[PDB]
Amino acid sequence: SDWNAPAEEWGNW
């Protein structure tokens, strides 16, 4: 689980 991709997306909009 040390490859943590964000749940919420970090978008430019």
Next chain:
Amino acid sequence: PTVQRGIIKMVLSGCAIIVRGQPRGGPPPERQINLSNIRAGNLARRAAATQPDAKDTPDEPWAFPAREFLRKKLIGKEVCFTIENKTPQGREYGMIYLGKDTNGENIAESLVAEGLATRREGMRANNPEQNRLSECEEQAKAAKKGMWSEGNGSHTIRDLKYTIENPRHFVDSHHQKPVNAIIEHVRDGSVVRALLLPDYYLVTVMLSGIKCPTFRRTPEPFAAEAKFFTESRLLQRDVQIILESCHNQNILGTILHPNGNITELLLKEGFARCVDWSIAVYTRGAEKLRAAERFAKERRLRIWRDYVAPT
């Protein structure tokens, strides 16, 4: 014509796209996908040390607006794509759609529709797909968008600056006021390459007060993971950077984003530790960095897996 899914990692020069799957084990798979049937302008390039006789070429007109167009619309988004061709040298060509089905927004069409990419000269007759690119192109020429505007388009060519005359003065002149920037690359978890606005400075930014595991010619424990942690949140994202200090050309600072502080996040995840040589230049309260690190150490997270509490 097999629709496969994926997530936009970054937008490349000539509007090429890197797509990734989600972490199912270790590093997520990557895929460079060139857009079929269209040709976008080439971004500025800096000559590699591998090729010493080569020199830095600038931006082609409307190349950077083309990259910025896709960056604003694709970064972090889920897309579906189909591969049309795969050259023997490994290069893949295909179509990219915004959404979950192939009837969503066609990226190639969006570019051509706004005069940010032109049709490739085909010698044969247009297929159904190549026909709409023609319609998009004519609508763009009629509206005089982008490359179809009146003049050079030389104003869209960045005066890229890979160095700074006097780093200390440049940082002090901003008085720790947040600077609009784009995170172009991620070396490791706590050091990134940022494009500073409005004068297009390409600089190296190190996070103040912390240090992630790094690579040295090779990766340290949790180096690749920490890099991905920062990459999956900030790569080609619009951010604000507080220019706090500098050492030579390297700039010490803090990256601001509506979703949170990556410096605190890295510490709380145990992907980084507090360092005392630079913690004084952290302007957003050093005591919170201590709390974030203390949080992770108590739970033996990542880099603190082999931590031995005093007793």
